[PDB]
Ligand binder design. Structure first.
Ligand code: HEM
Ligand code: HEM
Ligand SMILES: Cc1cc(N)nc(CCc2cc(N)cc(CCc3cc(C)cc(N)n3)c2)c1
Ligand SMILES: Cc1cc(N)nc(CCc2cc(N)cc(CCc3cc(C)cc(N)n3)c2)c1
Ligand SMILES: OC[C@@H](O)[C@@H](O)[C@H](O)[C@H](O)CO
Ligand SMILES: [Cl-]
Ligand SMILES: [Cl-]
Ligand SMILES: [Cl-]
Ligand SMILES: [Cl-]
Ligand SMILES: [Zn+2]
Ligand SMILES: [Zn+2]
Ligand SMILES: [Zn+2]
Lengths: 411, 407
């Protein structure tokens, strides 16, 4: 099968053949599209084909397909699986696999960068204290005094599912949220449940609007343990506006390092349940989502009020006007402080260049339009008019249940 | 068999059961989602007729009644004998309203039941088609107090006597390739304009020339007609704060009337079925004005605003976009021409969708089209999970007639 995608702005038509390598399910069928649904132990028998498929891909990529080295490796893994029910990745394979999981991440507009990922191998880690040290090192490396560098840290793979490594935080750095008796929220509403867990576990909460959460870390299936990230390692940016001098008195700031820590990395059938990865922000993630979602910091009203916009009717577009000014502020603040950030025009322009290159060299670039098109000004970015095909390639990043839902407490 | 949709803003969860009535294909498979692809005989007719008549008789609470059974037989008899059948006026009206109700890409469906249906199945000639369309335009426009309407010409027979409106919308602007290399007018309409010229239209060659209608009756060669200029309501675009905005010489038409789609009811195919509503402001200010392959005015507006256009990160494009969209809404409002802003329309759609889940068991919706082309996240549809599926009666795409027509 050849599948065509068209760009409705340029009339450029591309041909996808990479979809023939797709594996897992999309959730969709011939009768129902689930394109806007956010979320729609392995046996020996299941594991060897998965491992073989991965190794064949790896050895093709190094131009050693069918070599003695390739064949010896398949045999070595086969024997390892039959006698241990699992296998260990070589470091080169782990690097390749992590980079490919990013390259395959259909919801990621930042993939032009995929080949420049620093992979920290933490598979020798045994304890939560060990995890804490690895994570601090990751943060320091990735932050790089504001010249941000993409990185992933990979903890030991799942064995029987009773010994999982997990970062209980959804991101390495994120702000606490506190539900008040009057039903209001102090700080970030997205993190209320996790904040309550930290407090229950012993965290002394400062109870302010931007308190950096402690890490809650589980090694080897043990109960998780609390650790404070050294404050000097957490780079933050006070938010101001280039023309509006009152913007700073909103008291806004954000952290520089976006670091997703709640996803599962699948490579050759192996499951890495603790694999925090980080890049740098696109400005709308902070300006649109984190600041202006109604269930997040929800600042639109306050900003528009200070701007003295006509808020009597939605048709003045007061909400849209304020939204643009906040996003200006986020970009201005990061740039002024020399902390890496990308605006949504630059990011989507680079994505389309990446995507076209992927079509030429790889036969495709799976992409989820719902996530790729930015949450403001969609139509004026080059991804809006670009048709995309969404499908699942491995290696991959996957969602997993929050661990407090599944953890067996030891006491 | 029961599907859940979640709202990520409210945590509200809804259950869809209506998808089990879906019939046509989505284009997606278990392996690949085509959600962002824009276009992904006698034996066949009776089940479709039956499927439709069953839904109709259920709708008026007479399912399994003698009148239901008698109508089913009547239609069976008619297909057996004539190879087709004719809808009762009641069925035609129900079918057209439901094709709108079922349009998963339309944010405006809260209004679905208020549609005015003009039955033009007695039309036989292109000149007749022209008369029906002027009447639709005048009725729908209603001096700026716009009213939804559809006009339904005769159904397809053997497929070589199709009624077609060759225009993509009843009202749209000409586009002309220039010796310059640039485009004058609307680049979306370049090809259709050339066909009109080929067919003999005296083109004014200006920036906002309302295209003539090119109408095909009974599979005959299409004919050219000019909509009475006094029936085409237009709005000059100005800004409530920027006095220079009017200098750009911008205007748009008040009536959005899609005229290139096909209406399927009970297996019958209505290849000419122009329908109209009123505009959501982003359709003119974001798509028509700011797409690069449309009027592409972002740069000129930003220049007049004196924005820093050195770097994308100043968000000059976003700034000019908002101002253009303010000016569209202001202009329509000031001239008392119905228009809806994207916050109001999406709020109404969420209210409609909840109604539909509770009274109908679901509401097929295509997030890619339902989320407005600017400020997506700050509208209540962004955080709303949707299920997209195809119910009939339906509006469908069909190929442009110049690729098909035998002259
Ligand atoms: C280098 C700079 C990066 C940028 C600018 C970037 C940008 C983004 C954005 C904007 C989204 C979601 C759309 C939105 O939030 O509006 C996203 C999603 C995602 N990205 Fe990236 N990304 C970057 C690096 C990375 C890295 C290093 C990885 C992993 C190695 C990664 C993997 C993912 C994944 C798996 C998702 C989907 C998350 C989910 O489903 O919840 N990205 N990216
Ligand atoms: C009454 C006011 C109406 C409003 C505000 C409205 C709004 C819209 C919008 C905004 C879109 C496309 C998304 C976009 O342009 O950003 C759309 C698509 C559509 N609407 Fe409506 N609509 C209205 C009335 C109607 C009527 C009366 C019908 C048919 C009887 C209809 C059927 C459709 C169909 C079939 C599409 C998909 C068109 C395509 O695939 O190109 N709508 N609507
Ligand atoms: C490594 C990395 C770097 C970087 N800069 N950004 C990311 C993505 C982080 C992310 C985090 C959260 N909490 C939510 C979303 C979108 C949540 C969302 C999106 C859409 C389109 C709909 C919906 N309901 N929710 C994205 C990862
Ligand atoms: C009856 C009626 C009333 C009313 N107010 N609006 C309409 C819709 C008219 C319409 C017309 C055109 N040419 C394009 C689009 C979106 C084209 C589009 C959308 C998306 C999301 C992507 C893409 N490539 N193209 C919509 C109909
Ligand atoms: O407070 C808990 C939440 O932060 C958490 O459940 C996230 O929503 C989840 O991990 C998805 O990112
Ligand atoms: Cl974030
Ligand atoms: Cl979100
Ligand atoms: Cl339009
Ligand atoms: Cl468009
Ligand atoms: Zn799909
Ligand atoms: Zn959001
Ligand atoms: Zn467009």
């Amino acid at each position: 099968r050849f599948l065509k995608v068209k760009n409705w702005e340029t009339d450029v038509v591309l041909t996808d053949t990479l979809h023939l390598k797709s594996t897992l399910e999309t959730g969709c069928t011939e009768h129902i599209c689930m394109g806007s649904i956010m979320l729609p132990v392995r046996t020996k028998d299941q594991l060897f084909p998965l491992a073989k498929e991965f190794l064949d891909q790896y050895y093709s990529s190094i131009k050693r397909f069918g070599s003695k080295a390739h064949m010896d490796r398949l045999e070595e893994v086969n024997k390892e699986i039959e006698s241990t029910s699992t296998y260990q990745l070589k470091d080169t394979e782990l690097i390749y696999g992590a980079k490919h999981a990013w390259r395959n991440a259909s919801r990621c507009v930042g993939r032009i960068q995929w080949s420049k990922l620093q992979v920290f191998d933490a598979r020798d880690c045994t304890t939560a204290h060990g995890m804490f040290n690895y994570i601090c090192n990751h943060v320091k490396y990735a932050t790089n005094k504001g010249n941000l560098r993409s990185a992933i840290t990979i903890f030991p793979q799942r064995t029987d599912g009773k010994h999982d490594f997990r970062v209980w935080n959804s991101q390495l750095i994120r702000y606490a949220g506190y539900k008040q008796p009057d039903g209001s929220t102090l700080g970030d509403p997205a993190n209320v449940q996790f904040t309550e867990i930290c407090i229950q576990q012993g965290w002394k909460a400062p109870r302010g609007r931007f308190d950096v959460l402690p890490l809650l870390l589980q090694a080897n299936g043990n109960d998780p343990e609390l650790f404070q990230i050294p404050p000097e390692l957490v780079l933050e940016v006070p938010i101001r506006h280039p023309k509006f001098d009152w913007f700073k008195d909103l008291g806004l700031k954000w952290y520089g390092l976006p670091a997703v820590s709640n996803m599962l990395l699948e490579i050759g059938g192996l499951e890495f349940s603790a694999c925090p990865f980080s890049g740098w922000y696109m400005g709308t993630e902070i300006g649109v989502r984190d600041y202006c979602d109604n269930h997040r910091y929800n600042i639109l009203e306050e900003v528009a009020k200070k701007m003295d916009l006509d808020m009597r009717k939605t048709s003045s577009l007061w909400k849209d006007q304020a939204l643009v000014e906040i996003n200006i502020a986020v970009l201005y603040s990061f740039q002024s402080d020399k902390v890496t950030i990308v605006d949504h025009h630059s990011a989507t322009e680079s994505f389309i260049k990446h995507m076209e290159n992927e079509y030429r060299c790889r036969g495709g670039c799976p992409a989820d339009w719902v996530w790729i098109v930015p949450p403001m000004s969609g139509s004026i970015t080059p991804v809006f008019h670009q048709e995309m095909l969404n499908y699942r390639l491995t290696p991959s990043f996957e969602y997993q249940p929050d661990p407090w839902n599944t953890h067996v407490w030891k006491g």
